């Protein structure tokens, strides 16, 4: 098989070999071992043949696979491997290196394959192996398809062994005006054949011999015999007969219009509707040809014609073959005045290239399945509550949604994340950007899925992790800024309702924690809400969407969530002890994303994003908003008070047992609050200052960050050496961002003594380990365990403090090297 790479010269032979091997695989009376051998051969060949040469095999599979019968298990694996290997050839606009770029027909076949498999699997009864095999194939095809690919031959008809059946053309009747056109088009087409004869230099000879280059029937239509006139008309008779059989209203308005004198046809160009008219007419001509070919197959007892496929499958050139004749007929109809009207069912997508984009249809189907999910989840909840039901009439729907859609959604939106976050101003992906409609549909999907899973984690059971992962992916792929700035009120209301429901659930959880509803809330908030809310806030903060997303009602919900989590500080219950880390992380992300300086309410009048500034004082009374921002909720101290308390505690040397709330909630909140408001407060790069910038709404300088870092280091030093401290790593990770603004004096003030203590401890442990060697083989084991424990705690302290030190060095190595520093030399020594 490896030798087949680069065999483009013998392309026909290679294609025939692939077709023959596939037909052998789809063979009866074959042992299992024989079938396995054939399948292995096919996969090995396709693993090396160039992607362009597999177009015809893909064409065959587009017809065979959608059936999803037993013989579709291997084709599905073949397609999975093919698309996983050649995704670039189809996705990237440039294409794969040295292989080229996909063609429009290949992309059309890929879309048809995806939708056929999806539709069949939707109505297919659940089968473990079939699903386990089909899901990866769907993921691969979806990942290969470009998100914004628009199908040129898009149609809404979605109509349908291969079927060669044409319509009841000879059955239906024909108008006499259409018969007159039959005669006229006989004139035109006979003259065109004679014109091509002239191009070939064919004379009016005694016979049609091509070698003699003569025509025996080259006469003006009058002499051109009546019987031969009828024969030449017969194709036109059948064509117009099928036209009528389709209920295609033919309306004549104008009149129709040896030496060939064929009325030139190219003068007018078929419109869009006329173009598809003649495309489907060519397809029916091919269908009559296929009825004849099926008669031939019946006579032969078998066989398969190479072009025994539908028009859409047929590539352009073979399409073009019958396209010429069909369009010629339609075009002469138009000239002679027979303005036939079809009345399609596809104009509903007039223009709407956005609607034709692949991601558009995929998201529409996803939303519809979310609706179906709402129905069957309501039914399942009702039956669980009362009247046990085990038949589960939506069992197939449940299995499909939980075994296909969730892995699909997850993979698709993990891959095409950049496309959905790109904007016309800033394209941050390879190429292309999601339209506003797609951005809104993805938000609707996220909100609907969150609502579906709300207070229903148990119902999904083992698929709850999958639902949570899908929510994570969608949140990371959400374009909240665009959706909120310009989006339908329905989508905006969905997002606002998500935030409000999250705030309410958090409030109920916190009140319960301080002391089936209770358990349901606890297991839902701890498993789905808090992680998803944390991811959403992190995404908003990272993409700087806070100023545009978190406003008005969203701002109120964020206030409630934030200061409820904070108010959960006085409690000392073991559940609180266990849940503090996640709550602190959520608070840190929310403090990073919140566009209002909640710790500095005295300067809120300078904030342009504050609800007190946006909503007029006449407003904010319709809601429950207090009169002054200070009363939004007072439990949280101001920035000055928080800094003073943290400094005082660090100096006093309190331990984690005496400061559990601080270390796990307040410090992580501050390590995200200070970096965000430093850039927007004074002592920040003023590029936009000249436009009469109003005074900053915050007072954060580098002094705040330096003091906070010093206090964090003091706290870690005070808790150095303790037997159990898992919060050290979390605190270091949360503190990392604030180190970029550390001042030079921090080195000598804090870092030198800390690393000095660490080095001293390392020396002590090494000395003990040395004496352990002198000790014998019996007491050494206990001593070995002792020194093991000491080295473990030392390594914990090192892995807690060094990452902070590394960032400090990175931000000061240049200065240290430019100007020699004895303190830096001492740090190097340590």
């Amino acid at each position: 098989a490896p030798l087949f790479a680069g065999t483009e010269h013998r392309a026909i032979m290679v294609d025939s070999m692939l077709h023959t091997v596939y037909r052998l695989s789809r063979g009866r009376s074959l042992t299992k071992a024989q079938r396995d051998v054939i399948e292995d051969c096919l996969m090995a060949l396709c693993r090396y043949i160039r992607p362009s040469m597999l177009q015809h095999l893909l064409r065959r599979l587009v017809f065979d696979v959608p059936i999803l019968n037993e013989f579709a298990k291997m084709p599905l694996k073949l397609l999975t491997n093919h698309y996983e290997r050649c995704w670039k050839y189809y996705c990237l606009p440039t294409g794969w290196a040295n292989f080229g770029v996909t063609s429009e027909e290949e992309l059309h076949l890929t879309r048809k394959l995806f939708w056929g498999i999806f539709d069949s699997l939707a109505h297919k009864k659940y089968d473990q192996e079939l699903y386990r095999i089909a899901m990866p194939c769907l993921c691969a095809i979806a990942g290969a398809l470009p998100p914004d690919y628009v199908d040129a031959s898009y149609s809404s008809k979605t109509e349908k062994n291969f079927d060669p059946r044409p319509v009841e053309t000879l059955n239906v009747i024909i108008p006499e005006k259409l018969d007159s056109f039959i005669n006229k088009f006989a004139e035109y087409t006979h003259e065109k054949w004679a014109f091509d004869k002239i191009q070939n230099n064919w004379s009016y000879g005694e016979n049609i011999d091509e070698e003699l280059k003569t025509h025996p029937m080259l006469r003006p239509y009058k002499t051109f015999s009546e019987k031969d006139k009828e024969i030449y008309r017969w194709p036109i008779k059948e064509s117009l007969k099928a036209m009528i059989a389709w209920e295609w209203t033919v309306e004549k308005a104008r009149e129709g219009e040896y030496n060939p004198q064929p009325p030139d046809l190219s003068v007018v160009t078929l419109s869009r509707e006329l173009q598809a008219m003649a495309e489907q007419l060519a397809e029916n001509y091919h269908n009559t040809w296929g009825r004849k070919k099926k008669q031939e197959l019946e006579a032969k007892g078998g066989g398969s014609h190479p072009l025994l496929v539908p028009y859409d499958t047929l590539t352009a050139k073979e399409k073009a073959r019958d396209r010429e004749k069909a369009q010629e007929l339609l075009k002469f109809l138009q000239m002679n005045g027979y303005a036939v009207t079809r009345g399609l069912k596809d104009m509903e997508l007039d223009t709407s290239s956005i609607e034709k984009r692949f991601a558009f249809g995929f998201l529409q189907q996803l939303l519809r399945w979310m609706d179906i999910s709402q129905e069957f989840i309501a039914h399942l909840e009702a039956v669980v509550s009362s009247g046990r039901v085990e038949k589960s009439p939506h069992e197939q729907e449940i299995k499909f949604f939980a075994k296909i859609l969730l892995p699909l959604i997850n993979q698709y939106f993990t891959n095409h994340c950049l496309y959905f976050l790109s904007t016309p101003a800033k394209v941050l992906g390879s190429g292309g950007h999601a339209s506003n409609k797609e951005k809104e549909m993805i938000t609707s999907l996220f909100c609907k899925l969150a609502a579906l899973v709300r207070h229903r984690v148990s119902l999904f059971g083992t698929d709850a992790p999958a639902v949570v992962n899908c929510l994570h992916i969608l949140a990371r792929s959400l374009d909240a800024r665009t959706v909120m700035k310009s989006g339908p009120e329905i989508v905006k209301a969905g997002l606002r309702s998500f935030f409000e429901s999250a705030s309410e659930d958090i409030e109920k959880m916190v009140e319960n924690l301080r002391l089936k509803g209770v358990g349901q809330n606890l297991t839902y908030t701890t498993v789905a809400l808090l992680p998803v809310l944390t991811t959403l806030f992190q995404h908003i903060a990272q993409h700087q969407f806070g100023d545009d997303v978190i406003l008005d009602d969203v701002q109120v919900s964020c206030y409630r969530t934030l200061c409820s989590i904070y108010s959960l500080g006085t409690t000392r219950n073991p559940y609180v002890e266990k849940l503090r880390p996640a709550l602190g992380e959520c608070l840190a992300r929310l403090a990073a994303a919140m566009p209002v300086a909640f710790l500095e309410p005295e300067l809120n009048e300078y904030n342009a994003c504050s609800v007190y500034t946006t909503k007029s004082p006449r407003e904010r009374a319709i809601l429950g908003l207090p009169n002054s921002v200070e009363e939004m909720c007072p439990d949280i101290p101001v920035l000055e008070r928080l800094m003073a308390e943290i400094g005082g505690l660090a100096e006093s040397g309190a331990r984690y047992t005496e400061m559990p709330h601080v270390i796990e909630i307040t410090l992580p909140m501050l390590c995200s609050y200070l970096p965000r408001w430093w850039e927007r407060g004074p002592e920040a790069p003023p590029p936009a200052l000249p436009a009469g910038a109003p005074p900053p709404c915050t007072a954060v300088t580098s002094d705040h960050l330096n003091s906070l870092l010093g206090n964090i280091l003091r706290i870690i030093v005070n808790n150095l050496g303790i037997d159990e401290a898992s919060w050290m790593k979390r605190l270091a990770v949360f503190a990392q961002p604030i180190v970029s603004r550390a001042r030079p004096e921090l080195l000598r003030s804090h870092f030198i003594p800390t690393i000095g203590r660490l080095r001293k401890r390392a020396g002590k442990v090494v000395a003990e380990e040395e004496q352990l060697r002198l000790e014998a083989k019996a007491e050494a084991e206990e001593g070995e365990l002792l020194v093991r424990d000491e080295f473990s705690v030392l390594c914990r302290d090192l892995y807690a403090l060094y990452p902070l030190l590394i960032r400090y060095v990175d931000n000061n190595r240049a200065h240290w090297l430019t100007e020699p520093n004895p303190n830096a030399e001492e740090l190097f020594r340590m």
Partner: protein
């Protein structure tokens, strides 16, 4: 050099033209079309 001391000097990299008594000569890609013999291995054109 503006950042050689900061990164590269200690790692042991020498400036490219460190001990050259003359500036290093440079060539540039001139976009003036010129006639040249058809390459013997040109992928697309062959002269017999």
């Amino acid at each position: 050099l503006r950042f050689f001391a900061i990164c590269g000097l200690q790692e042991g990299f020498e400036p490219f033209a460190i001990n050259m008594q003359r500036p290093v000569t440079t060539w540039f890609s001139k976009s003036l079309p010129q006639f040249e013999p058809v390459p013997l291995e040109h992928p697309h054109y062959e002269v017999a």
